[PDB]
Design a protein around this ligand. Structure first.
Ligand SMILES: CCCCCCCCCCCCCCCCCC(=O)OC[C@H](COP(=O)([O-])OCC(O)COP(=O)([O-])OC[C@@H](COC(=O)CCCCCCCCCCCCCCCCC)OC(=O)CCCCCCCCCCCCCCCCC)OC(=O)CCCCCCCCCCCCCCCCC
Ligand SMILES: CCCCCCCCCCCCCCCCCC(=O)OC[C@H](COP(=O)([O-])OCC(O)COP(=O)([O-])OC[C@@H](COC(=O)CCCCCCCCCCCCCCCCC)OC(=O)CCCCCCCCCCCCCCCCC)OC(=O)CCCCCCCCCCCCCCCCC
Ligand SMILES: CCCCCCCCCCCCCCCCCC(=O)OC[C@H](COP(=O)([O-])OC[C@H](O)COP(=O)([O-])OC[C@H](COC(=O)CCCCCCCCCCCCCCCCC)OC(=O)CCCCCCCCCCCCCCCCC)OC(=O)CCCCCCCCCCCCCCCCC
Ligand SMILES: CCCCCCCCCCCCCCCCCC(=O)OC[C@H](COP(=O)([O-])OCC[N+](C)(C)C)OC(=O)CCCCCCCCCCCCCCCCC
Ligand SMILES: CCCCCCCCCCCCCCCCCC(=O)OC[C@H](COP(=O)([O-])OCC[N+](C)(C)C)OC(=O)CCCCCCCCCCCCCCCCC
Ligand SMILES: CCCCCCCCCCCCCCCCCC(=O)OC[C@H](COP(=O)(O)OCCN)OC(=O)CCCCCCCCCCCCCCCCC
Ligand SMILES: CCCCCCCCCCCCCCCCCC(=O)OC[C@H](COP(=O)(O)OCCN)OC(=O)CCCCCCCCCCCCCCCCC
Ligand SMILES: CCCCCCCCCCCCCCCCCC(=O)OC[C@H](COP(=O)(O)OCCN)OC(=O)CCCCCCCCCCCCCCCCC
Ligand SMILES: CCCCCCCCCCCCCCCCCC(=O)OC[C@H](COP(=O)(O)OCCN)OC(=O)CCCCCCCCCCCCCCCCC
Lengths: 98, 47, 80, 120, 104, 48, 169, 347, 105, 171
């Protein structure tokens, strides 16, 4: 298949392995999650414009709206975690081991 | 079953509520010191 | 309802203008006589090509030429 | 398995061909067992709220019994419908495919040689 | 193409102005000068999230000047007034549950 | 061009059908120069 | 070179993703995701998604990444080995993939990929006096009725949900 | 929480589940999962303590990652099929990614690592919603995509879920973690029979939801979150010890109870397809589930643990809790095995 | 639990965005409209099992319309052989493939 | 698969209409009024055959009738037409509304010296009927034979033989 699809899928997997390997910050995790969304947006858009599939032109907008509302939910979770522990570190979220 | 790894684990609180574990202080001055210029204000702001 | 309306027009006239403009925007296109013509003009705007029909023998309403009498007309749009 | 059968007409609890089938009698032992489950639900409902178990809320025990019988009657109708559908599809598929279901040449035990294994 | 040329020219002129404004006042050798978490507010984060959600509702509203050209105008007008009404209902719930307070 | 290549059917369809398929951009401007390629394939997008 | 413009922008896109996904700090990670969103917008614009690319700039970079930088500014403090090492790791993996799919015009990581410029796969016709992408997006109001209902309901519920979970009570 | 807002948010949870269950388009499936997560986040943060914020954050990260992998599977499907019908997937990579995404949404092992943490961090009613209602929509999608599900993948996830949910509950004294590892083992049982007969999958899901709803309703009505707090139930309400006894004996898969029905039908439909080793190892592995269930019955109903003095004051007060459908769910979780051929209504 | 509420009630909630061959705004055709229509009208009603082994040619033509893998592979073969013959000097490009012929219309 | 069949370059030779787009747009209403029949034969053949290789003779008849149209303009009204398409040609959007007096002069000279009437607002978008002699394409998609469907269900629905047959349940 086309050459740009390789780079957009590899961008998804790069932001995936970034999201699947935390360093310290939950904000960087959410940045990797929305980079995954960005790569999904571009990949869906290139398919739908390439195919001239007219009605699915509204599909990436619905993807963008739902996942940005999801991002707002995640930022509010990070804000409540930061008001609990002072930072946004994922090593502070370890109370549920016991 | 206690092990060496799960040795420091205490059971959770009974109501599943943990302890929580401030307000800003501003040293303020008049913006353009033409009129007053000689005022010092130590604020305690709560946002 | 006349005391409440004058009271909310004295205290919060921005919200009264808001709900009045919104209520007119809701109930007004169902009461307007020109709302028909919006549909008529949008369905009369020729984006695609008028792909012609094979003349089988019995289509008395379909014209043979664009300047023929039979067919859909837009004299209502020229005149209004 | 049978999901393409009930896909032409979706979300029908009892289709129109279910009425060709005889309904369960109201003295069905399955339906009587469901009524016994209603009585048991009434007894547990009197027990968990510390009411007298057999006496209190006879209207409530009776609505438990009635509601379980009422649901279970239609459940038994759908059960008998789906097994009738299963047998109907089985028999029509056997009829449409005779090459896959050959009528077996049955031999009698005078020709059948079975190896005898003595217990000694 | 001409857009890319124009973007490169604007970026180049901006970078040239920034590079001049940092390196031109370094010509005059000056006397080397030798003498000598932030508090969180919930309302600052809430106005940004309220912006984000109403901006997504605006992203739904942006194809309206193309949507009026349709032949299904009654459905289109219904869904247009319905999106603006849901934006107004989000604003009303943000109002009445003390969400727009002290940054009103 | 494809004379030295063994087992090459010239004009072989990549589709099993005999229906007319609308040609791709690379099927038309494949052997032409890069300027004509750009002017046909990005020209409207890059126009002003 | 110029026929490979979408490919070169996609290489810049993957380099930006290796940039922020190696996670130096949420500030610089936000910057890398901004530059990545801009170049991926350029990728979308070079297929004829002008409205969808302006949706990237206006909505993604315009609202959402602004809220990410805003919330980062309220949660990080202003003033490594693993970040730079993972950066050059992803850069070498990407350039080895570029080198293979350029010297061979073919590669297979998970799927088979062409190595020519992606100009080849376009259409050779016109759309008349409209954009097909604009008319398909405009049909959200006449064809996407249920889609509008569930999207608006999810956004209203999202406002309600954010006011619940940030209330603390 | 405002009761109006509570009712609207639970209707939105149910709405997202229904949108997954009825829709024929992949975008609407993804929309339903998004709406479901977005609405269930306040239910987990109902009490506003740091364990609920941690549980909601972990749940958000897992379900968000699964939703993005779901959309990547959908996008690879749009590549390799040009369409959007919710049916079989036209690429094994899309099938693998969608099976991973649904395994993350169900919390099947080895994506199970959120379920006991998130279930411990949240109240018993929200844990009930998470372990019963949130299993419905991904099992519906797995019910629809099964012509393209890889067999080795789904059976690996299944047996790994059964084994890890067996060994996980043996170390636990918190009731919510016991129910979560029970969830992991039973989701393994559900997905093991999926490609063989998905009607038995729906039977296992329905019997599981009945029994788990019974156990969470008993734990709510007694206000017990630990083993040792459940141990005081004999001196407070002795009928509750009987009900948790018969329901834990049911969930262990003992005849003549209705928790034996699903695993017996699963073994019954896996031996038809010439698989003998796998249902035998699954059945032997479920004895671990039965072991920690019998541990709880020993601590609650079969012995009398020591109580304290202040229980005498609680003797003077009845339960004013709405123990909704608790007798009905207790009868259906135990006495339904004579009605085992009722499963044909799910065909 | 595909509760087909749409076919039960007769409502069209999402069947319109489902395929490319559906009704489109201003009758815009998809670039693989005919291939998808042929594959759907082949595979209609016979189920997935018969559709994967009896409509294989229509689905292969449709997948090769969508992805254009065989087309790009064929153009790669022609272009590589052309560049080899240019480097070997055994081939000249025509004037109508160099911009020297005052195009058709 | 098979070899695609293309026409020779001799079959693609025709006298083109080598005018500009403003020359065509200026003449477009009288072109749609006068060159109706070969144009609609061609577009009917083009939407029915779904193949531009079966439509080359109708394309040549279109390309010939257009030349007859512009020759018939050139013999009578070359100067008002030239002024009119120059005025159309100045505008970047090629507005008709900027050019109404040159349109009036061109329509006056065309109605006098050629008897042509400009179409009204609504006429050139009418769906017209075309009398052809070529046959209707019986399989324009070149579809092969459809697979035979699965058999329908038929018969009356009898009760299950001995009930459920689930291990011992006698109903
Ligand atoms: C029936 C079965 C279900 C009954 C549930 C309620 C039982 C109850 O409350 O009993 C008390 C009640 C009398 O008590 P009471 O004086 O009112 O007050 C109670 C005291 O306060 C009690 O004192 P206490 O509570 O202060 O403390 C003592 C303590 C004592 O408890 C303890 O010390 C704790 C436990 C000790 C160890 C465990 C022992 C075993 C207990 C559980 C059983 C497990 C095995 C079950 C089967 C195996 C599979 C697991 O607790 C109790 O005794 C609580 C009462 C419950 C005792 C009986 C438990 C029954 C439920 C479990 C069995 C049935 C369901 C499962 C079936 C599974 C499949 C077969 O008993 C009865 O009335 C029995 C019923 C007699 C009449 C039956 C009439 C039948 C009519 C049928 C025809 C009409 C209907 C037609 C329908 C069809 C129409 C078409
Ligand atoms: C069909 C599927 C039905 C699924 C269950 C639907 C009801 C539960 C959902 C809503 C709910 O929680 O309502 C409370 C719920 C009682 O559950 P609860 O919170 O445990 O209350 C226990 C006490 O009995 C509460 O007692 P109370 O002192 O507050 O007042 C007595 C109450 C007062 O009654 C009323 O107020 C009813 C009259 C008004 C009805 C609404 C009008 C609007 O009567 C009862 O509750 C008698 C028991 C009724 C039966 C409960 C279970 C129903 C059967 C579930 C399906 C069983 C299938 C077995 C299959 C086996 C084989 C697989 O239902 C009712 O109050 C009315 C039940 C009506 C049953 C109709 C069945 C046929 C429907 C067609
Ligand atoms: C003119 C219009 C009106 C005409 C009216 C004409 C009739 C007049 C009489 C009306 C009343 C009829 C009542 C039902 C008919 C009798 C059904 C029967 O016996 O089936 C034999 C059935 C099969 O034996 P069969 O010799 O082949 O058939 C003889 C008949 O032809 C059986 O006929 P069948 O071939 O049609 O049987 C169908 C099928 C035949 O069955 C099968 O195909 C085999 C599968 C049976 C279930 C196996 C489940 C295994 C796992 C569970 C183990 C449960 C352990 C026992 C209970 C533990 C404690 C709860 O049954 C089922 O599928 C139903 C499932 C079993 C429920 C049986 C009915 C119970 C109603 C009352 C419930 C009261 C509580 C009893 C205890 C609850 C459990 C039974 O045997 C059993 O199921 C064994 C248990 C005994 C059944 C209950 C006996 C009924 C009367 C109970 C009164 C005493 C209650 C004591 C207090 C409460 C308990 C503490
Ligand atoms: C285009 C937009 C407007 C741009 C700005 C306007 C155009 C003019 C730009 C050049 C301005 C003049 C030179 C820089 C300012 C020098 C001022 C100064 O104090 O210089 C002392 C400095 C240093 O003098 P100094 O050695 O006596 O240092 C004094 C400070 N102590 C002793 C403490 C170290 O002079 C220079 O460095 C000379 C700079 C180059 C002179 C001009 C060359 C041509 C420039 C073009
Ligand atoms: C809340 C409900 C708001 C929508 C009310 C109806 C708006 C409308 O015009 O719908 C017609 C539209 C479109 O109908 P239509 O009449 O335009 O259909 C003609 C066909 N097309 C679209 C191809 C031109 O929607 C439907 O008929 C079905 C979708 C919505 C079904 C109802 C959803 C209820 C949600 C409750 C939760
Ligand atoms: C094989 C599986 C992995 C494939 C990609 C490998 C990339 C190179 C990284 C290898 C692992 C390095 C490492 O230790 O990562 C851990 C690090 C988080 O650790 P941190 O908190 O930064 O430091 C404490 C040290 N444990 O985590 C990170 O730094 C995460 C960075 C991930 C970004 C991936 C970038 C693209 C990689 C190539 C394409 C995939
Ligand atoms: C039906 C058509 C569609 C309607 C929906 C679309 C609406 C579009 C406009 C969007 C408005 C978004 C925000 C709405 C918030 C409403 C709640 C509100 O503001 O209540 C508070 C207000 C008192 O203000 P307070 O809280 O004190 O503000 C601080 C300064 N004092 O309380 C008040 O001032 C009272 C507010 C309620 C009464 C307003 C009455 C206006 C009547 C106008 C004429 C009738 C118009 C038709 C609609 C029906 C109105 C009853
Ligand atoms: C108590 C349950 C009462 C059910 C009332 C009727 C509800 C209804 O309309 O159900 C339709 C459904 C049959 O629809 P069907 O197309 O077979 O479902 C495909 C699923 N894969 O029917 C059913 O699923 C009936 C069985 C429902 C049983 C639920 C409790 C066990
Ligand atoms: C193919 C399948 C298709 C679909 C089939 C149907 C699937 C049904 C799945 C059921 C999932 C139920 C999840 C729990 C209910 C959701 C709402 C809820 O949370 O209700 C509990 C309610 C909340 O009250 P609150 O005050 O917040 O709780 C704290 C205690 N004071 O109140 C309380 O906490 C009070 C305590 C009692 C609560 C009991 C609730 C029982 C509800 C479930 C009944 C059993 C399921 C239905 C029958 C089987 C269906 C398969």
């Amino acid at each position: 298949m086309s050459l740009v699809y390789m780079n957009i899928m590899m961008a998804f997997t790069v932001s995936l392995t970034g999201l699947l390997m935390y360093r310290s910050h939950l904000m960087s995790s959410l940045l990797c999650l929305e980079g995954m969304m960005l790569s999904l947006f571009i990949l869906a858009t290139l398919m739908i414009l390439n195919s001239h599939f007219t009605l699915a032109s509204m599909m990436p907008i619905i993807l963008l709206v739902f996942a940005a509302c999801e991002a707002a939910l995640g930022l509010s979770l990070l804000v409540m975690v930061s008001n609990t522990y002072g930072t946004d570190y994922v090593q502070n979220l370890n109370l549920l081991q016991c | 079953y206690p092990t060496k790894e799960t040795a420091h684990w205490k059971p959770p609180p009974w109501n599943d509520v943990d302890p929580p574990k401030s307000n800003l202080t501003l040293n303020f001055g008049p913006q353009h010191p033409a009129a007053h210029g000689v005022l010092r204000l130590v604020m305690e702001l709560s946002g | 309802v006349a005391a409440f309306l004058k009271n909310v027009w004295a205290k919060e006239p921005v919200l009264v203008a808001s709900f009045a403009i919104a209520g007119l925007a809701v109930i007004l296109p169902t009461l307007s006589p020109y709302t028909k013509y919006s549909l008529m003009i949008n369905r009369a705007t020729p984006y695609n090509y008028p792909v012609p029909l094979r003349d089988d023998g019995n289509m008395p309403d379909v014209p043979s030429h664009p300047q023929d009498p039979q067919g859909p007309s837009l004299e209502w749009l020229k005149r209004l | 398995m049978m999901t393409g059968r009930q896909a032409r007409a979706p979300l029908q609890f009892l289709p129109d061909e279910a009425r060709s089938l005889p309904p369960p009698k109201l003295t069905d032992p399955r339906l009587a067992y469901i009524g016994f489950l209603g009585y048991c639900s009434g007894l547990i409902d009197n027990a968990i709220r510390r009411r007298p178990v057999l006496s209190a809320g006879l209207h409530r025990q009776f609505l438990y019994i009635t509601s379980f019988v009422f649901v279970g009657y239609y459940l038994l109708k759908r059960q008998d419908y789906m097994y009738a559908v299963r047998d109907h599809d089985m028999f029509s598929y056997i009829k449409s495919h005779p090459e896959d279901f050959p009528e077996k040449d049955k031999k009698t035990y005078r020709e059948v040689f079975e190896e005898f294994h003595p217990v000694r | 193409m001409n857009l890319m040329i124009t973007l490169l020219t604007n970026f180049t002129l901006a970078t040239l102005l920034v590079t001049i404004a940092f390196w031109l006042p370094q010509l005059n050798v000056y006397s080397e000068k030798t003498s000598p978490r932030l508090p969180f507010s919930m309302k600052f984060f809430l106005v940004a999230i309220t912006f984000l959600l109403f901006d997504l509702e605006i992203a739904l509203l942006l194809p309206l000047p193309w949507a009026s050209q349709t032949t299904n105008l009654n459905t289109m007008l219904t869904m247009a007034l319905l999106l603006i009404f849901l934006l107004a209902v989000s604003l009303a719930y943000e109002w009445t549950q003390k969400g727009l307070e002290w940054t009103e | 061009i494809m004379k030295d290549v063994p087992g090459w059917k010239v004009g072989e369809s990549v589709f099993h059908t005999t229906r007319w398929v609308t040609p791709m951009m690379g099927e038309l401007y494949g052997l032409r120069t890069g300027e004509e390629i750009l002017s046909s394939t990005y020209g409207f997008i890059w126009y002003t | 070179m110029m026929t490979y413009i979408v490919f070169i922008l996609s290489i810049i896109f993957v380099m930006g993703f290796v940039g922020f996904s190696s996670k130096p700090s949420p500030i610089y990670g936000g910057l890398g995701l901004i530059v990545s969103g801009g170049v991926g917008c350029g990728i979308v614009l070079n297929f004829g998604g002008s409205f969808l690319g302006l949706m990237v700039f206006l909505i993604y970079l315009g609202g959402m990444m602004v809220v990410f930088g805003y919330t980062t500014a309220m949660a990080t403090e202003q003033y490594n080995k693993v970040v730079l090492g993972t950066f050059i790791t992803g850069l070498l993996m990407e350039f080895l993939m570029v080198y293979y799919v350029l010297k061979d015009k073919e590669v297979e990581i998970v799927f088979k990929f062409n190595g020519m410029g992606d100009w080849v796969i376009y259409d050779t016709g016109d759309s008349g006096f409209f954009s097909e992408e604009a008319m398909g997006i405009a049909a959200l109001y006449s064809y996407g009725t249920w889609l509008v209902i569930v999207t608006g309901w999810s956004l209203l519920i999202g406002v309600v949900v954010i006011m619940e979970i940030t209330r603390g009570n | 929480m405002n009761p109006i807002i509570l009712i609207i948010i639970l209707m939105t949870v149910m709405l997202g589940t229904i949108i997954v269950m009825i829709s024929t388009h992949w975008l609407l499936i993804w929309i339903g999962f998004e709406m479901n997560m977005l609405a269930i986040i306040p239910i987990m943060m109902k009490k506003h303590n740091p364990r609920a914020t941690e549980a909601s954050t972990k749940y958000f990260l897992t379900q968000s990652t699964a939703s993005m992998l779901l959309m990547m599977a959908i996008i690879i499907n749009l590549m390799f099929s040009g369409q959007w019908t919710v049916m079989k997937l036209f690429n094994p990579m899309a099938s693998m990614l969608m099976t991973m995404a649904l395994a993350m949404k169900l919390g099947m092992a080895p994506f199970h690592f959120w379920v006991p943490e998130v279930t411990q961090g949240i109240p018993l009613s929200s844990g009930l919603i998470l372990l019963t209602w949130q299993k419905l929509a991904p099992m519906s999608v797995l019910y629809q995509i099964l012509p393209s599900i890889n067999l080795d993948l789904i059976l690996t996830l299944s047996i790994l879920s059964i084994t890890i949910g067996g060994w996980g509950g043996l170390n636990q004294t918190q009731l919510r973690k016991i129910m979560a590892y029970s969830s992991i083992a039973h989701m393994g049982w559900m997905t093991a029979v999926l490609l063989y007969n998905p009607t038995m999958t729906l039977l296992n899901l329905i019997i599981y939801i009945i029994m788990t709803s019974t156990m969470f309703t008993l734990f709510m009505a007694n206000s017990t979150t630990t083993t040792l707090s459940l141990s005081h139930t004999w001196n407070k309400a002795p009928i509750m010890t009987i009900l948790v006894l018969i329901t834990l004996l049911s969930m262990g898969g003992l005849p003549p109870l209705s928790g034996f029905m699903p695993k017996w039908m699963i073994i019954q439909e896996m031996t038809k397809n010439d698989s003998i080793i796998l249902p035998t190892l699954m059945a032997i592995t479920a004895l671990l589930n039965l072991y920690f269930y019998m541990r709880l019955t020993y601590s609650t109903a079969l012995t009398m643990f020591p109580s304290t003095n202040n229980m005498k004051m609680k003797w003077q007060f009845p339960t004013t809790k709405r123990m909704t459908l608790l007798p009905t769910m207790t009868v259906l979780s135990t006495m339904l095995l004579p009605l085992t051929p009722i499963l044909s209504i799910l065909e | 639990p595909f509760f087909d509420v749409q076919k039960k009630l007769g409502v069209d909630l999402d069947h319109w965005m489902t395929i490319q061959s559906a009704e489109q705004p201003h009758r815009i055709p998809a670039r693989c409209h005919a291939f998808e229509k042929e594959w759907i009208e082949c595979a209609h009603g016979i189920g997935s099992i018969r559709a994967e082994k009896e409509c294989k040619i229509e689905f292969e033509d449709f997948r090769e319309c969508l992805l254009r893998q065989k087309t790009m592979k064929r153009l790669n073969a022609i272009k590589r052989q052309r560049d080899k013959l240019i480097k070997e000097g055994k081939y000249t490009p025509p004037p109508h493939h160099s911009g020297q012929e005052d195009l058709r219309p | 698969p098979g070899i695609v069949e293309l026409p020779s370059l001799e079959d693609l030779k025709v006298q083109e209409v080598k005018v500009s787009s403003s020359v065509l747009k200026a003449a477009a209403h009288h072109y749609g009024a006068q060159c109706d029949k070969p144009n609609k034969e061609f577009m009917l053949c083009r939407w029915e055959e779904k193949d531009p290789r079966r439509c080359l003779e109708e394309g040549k008849l279109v390309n010939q009738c257009a030349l007859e149209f512009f020759r018939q303009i050139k013999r009578h009204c070359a100067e008002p037409f030239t002024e009119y398409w120059t005025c159309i040609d100045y505008s970047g959007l090629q507005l008709f509304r900027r050019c109404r007096k040159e349109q009036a002069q061109f329509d006056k000279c065309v109605l006098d010296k050629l008897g042509w009437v400009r179409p009204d607002l609504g006429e050139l978008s009418k769906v017209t009927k075309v009398k052809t002699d070529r046959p209707l394409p019986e399989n324009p998609y070149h579809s092969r034979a459809r697979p035979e469907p699965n058999p329908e269900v038929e018969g009356d629905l009898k009760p299950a033989r001995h009930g459920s047959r689930l291990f011992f349940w006698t109903m």
